[PDB]
């Protein structure tokens, strides 16, 4: 039997997903943690055995700390107990839902879009979830991915970094497009990164209407309060650094970077078609 629906943020890497999840973390109706790394796995033992991350990836540990007012050691002890009994991932999600209730979980990870079977698992575990599809211009994503030296994470450190980055953007976006094409229009909402940082009030107000929550001022203040970004920096990171703490406001200047970014190669024809579908211009 499926769990009550949650909210997913789906995106390519480097699309401002962390910024968005942190904005939403401020809303009293929502609970929006660093990556939980639950969705890709069937059981907690599978997760423990297979979950290897460049940084500490303590989203789940931090979640139990917040919702149960626990120190790090006690939260870890709880997670180890779930692993020892080998709870299903659905059982752990159910436990999270009860511990955050009446708040709704916001589940964000750019890695979900890399595997169509992971996207499908969301629909298998949950009923009537809502999907926020966050998109960013391919030039901006590619420049960032290459700058951050993420090519190794794909298992393609021997190929051209720019082409590897392009493939990540193209595959993630095509996978999301394919997945969402099968779902009710009423359960999906697109956000463009460029709009998010240039017009956050308008974007967030429209998102609030989609989520059926009222607007709260905290949405516009991602650097205020406890939004699970504090303490040891490496603890909220998983696959790379979103560079959220290298800024101190919603920084609009990062939107238009695509207007001047010079990539070594024109995007492949297939990538250009995806960009066209998403209404991005390619200078
Ligand atoms: N406060 C802020 N304002 C605007 N954009 C931000 C931001 N913090 C992070 N970002 C953008 O989000 C990107 C990371 O996205 P994600 O969280 O999906 O990995 C960053 O990549 P760069 O710092 O490499 O430019 C940056 O462009
Ligand atoms: Cl990323
Ligand atoms: Cl991320
Ligand atoms: Cl994940
Ligand atoms: Cl994972
Ligand atoms: Cl730590
Ligand atoms: Cl990141
Ligand atoms: Cl940072
Ligand atoms: Cl950060
Ligand atoms: Cl800034
Ligand atoms: Zn993960
Ligand atoms: Zn720690
Ligand atoms: Zn990221
Ligand atoms: Zn950082
Ligand atoms: Zn800045």
Contact 7, 132 (CB under 8 A): yes
137 annotated ligand binder: no
Q: Which two tokens mark 260?
A: 């001047």
Nearest to 80 by CA among 28, 36, 32, 45: 45
Alpha-carbon distances of 145 from 150, 152, 161, 240, 260, rounded to whole Å: 6, 11, 9, 9, 17
Contact 216, 30 (CB under 8 A): no
Give the position, in ligand 1's atom list, of the atom nearest the Cα of 241: 19
Q: Judge if the beta carbon of residue 16 lies within 6 A of ligand 1.
A: yes
Distance (Å, whole) CA 282 – CA 114: 24
Distance (Å, whole) CA 18 – CA 255: 15
Distance (Å, whole) CA 88 – CA 47: 10
Alpha-carbon distances of 181 from 110, 178, 185, 188, rounded to whole Å: 19, 5, 8, 10
**Dihedral, 192, 193, 197, 199 alpha carbons, nearest 10:** 0
Q: Judge if the beta carbon of residue 81 lies within 6 A of ligand 1.
A: no
Alpha carbon of residue 195 to chain centroid = 17
Distance (Å, whole) CA 212 – CA 214: 7
Resolution attained, angstroms: 1.6
Distance (Å, whole) CA 64 – CA 100: 10
Contact 21, 210 (CB under 8 A): no
CA of 242 to the centre of ligand 7 (A): 4
Contacts of 252 (CB under 8 A, 6+ apart): 197, 198
* Largest separation between any pair of C-alpha atoms in the chain: 55
CA of 20 to the centre of ligand 10 (A): 15
Nearest to 16 by CA among 176, 205, 196, 237: 196
Distance (Å, whole) CA 278 – CA 252: 20
Q: Which two tokens mark 281?
A: 């211009």
Nearest CA to ligand 1 atom 11: 16
Candidate from 242, 251, 257 with most ligand 1 atoms within 8 A of CB, to mutate: 242
What DSSP line would sit under the chain, residue for residue?
A: -PEEP-EEEEE-TTSSHHHHHHHHHT-TTEE--S----TT-SBHHHHHHH---SS---HHHHHHHHHHT--HHHHHHHHHHHHHHT-BHHHHHHHHHHHHTTSEEEEE-GGGGG-HHHHHHHHHHEES-EEEEEE--HHHHHHHHHHTTGGGGGT-SSS-HHHHHHHHHHHHHHHHHHHHTTS-GGGEEEEEHHHHHHSHHHHHHHHHHHHT----GGGG-TTSS--S--SSGGGG-SSS---GGG-SS--GGGGGGGGT---SSPPPHHHHHHHHHTT----
Residue with tokens 């190929």: 159
Nearest CA to ligand 1 atom 4: 251
Contact 122, 38 (CB under 8 A): no
Distance (Å, whole) CA 271 – CA 280: 11
Q: Which two tokens mark 178?
A: 């394919």
Contacts of 153 (CB under 8 A, 6+ apart): 54, 239, 240
Helix axes 116-125, 161-180, angle to 10 degrees: 30
Q: Which domains, ranges and CATH numbers included, belong to the chain?
A: 1-283 (3.40.50.300)
């Amino acid at each position: 039997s499926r769990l009550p629906g949650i909210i997913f943020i789906l995106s390519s890497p480097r699309s401002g997903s962390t910024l968005l999840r942190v904005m939403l973390a401020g809303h009293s109706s929502l609970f929006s943690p660093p990556e939980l790394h639950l969705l890709p796995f069937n059981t907690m033992k599978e997760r423990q055995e297979q979950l290897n991350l460049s940084y500490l990836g303590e989203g789940l540990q931090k979640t139990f700390m917040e919702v149960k007012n626990l120190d790090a050691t006690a939260s870890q002890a709880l997670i180890k107990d779930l692993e020892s009994q080998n709870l299903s991932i659905q059982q752990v999600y159910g436990m999270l839902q009860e511990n955050i209730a009446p708040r709704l979980l916001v589940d964000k990870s750019p890695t979900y879009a890399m595997e169509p079977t992971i996207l499908e698992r969301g629909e298998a575990l949950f009923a009537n979830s809502k999907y926020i599809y966050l998109v960013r211009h391919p030039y901006s994503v590619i420049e960032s991915f290459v700058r951050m030296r993420m090519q190794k994470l794909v298992g393609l450190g021997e190929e051209n970094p720019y082409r590897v980055a392009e493939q990540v953007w193209a595959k993630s976006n095509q996978n999301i497009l394919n997945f969402l094409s099968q779902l009710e229009p009423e359960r999906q909402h697109q956000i463009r990164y460029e709009d998010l940082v240039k017009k956050p009030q308008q974007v967030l107000s429209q998102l609030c209407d989609f989520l059926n929550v009222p607007f709260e001022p905290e949405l516009l203040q991602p650097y205020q309060g406890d939004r699970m970004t504090g303490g040891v920096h490496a603890a909220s990171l998983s696959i790379s650094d979103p560079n959220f703490l290298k800024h101190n406001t919603i920084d609009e200047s990062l939107a238009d970077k695509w207007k001047t970014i010079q990539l070594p190669y024109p995007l492949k024809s297939e990538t250009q078609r995806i960009a066209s579908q998403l209404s991005y211009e390619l200078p």
